[PDB]
């Protein structure tokens, strides 16, 4: 139960079934970064007061 | 508790003065249950400080 579970933890002892643990990570990472010519159009512009 | 009255029946006096404050909650060992560095975790041990 969610009781009678709650002693068997407690104290140590295996209630006949398993578990299987996930997490979670975050890392950070560098990175080079390639492209041939004339990839895109980027156009410029006016600018505005 | 200084002792009162005979040996004879001195367990049903404290039988009945302990009816009360005995059901209450709990005395201050639970640790033998407990595991090591249950002790040490910050839940578990009220008694810890």
């Given at each position: 139960?969610?009781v009678a579970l709650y ?6 002892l295996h209630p006949g ?12 990472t560098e990175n080079v ?17 | ?49």
């Amino acid at each position: 139960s969610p009781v009678a579970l709650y002693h068997q933890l407690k104290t140590g002892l295996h209630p006949g079934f398993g578990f299987t643990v996930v997490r979670q990570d975050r890392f950070v990472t560098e990175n080079v970064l390639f492209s041939e010519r004339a990839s895109e159009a980027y156009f410029l512009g006016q600018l505005q007061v | 508790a200084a002792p009162a009255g005979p040996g004879a029946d001195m367990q049903q006096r404290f039988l009945n003065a302990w009816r009360q404050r005995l059901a209450h909650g709990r005395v201050r060992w639970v640790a033998e249950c407990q595991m090591t560095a249950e002790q040490f975790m910050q839940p578990d041990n009220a008694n810890l400080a």
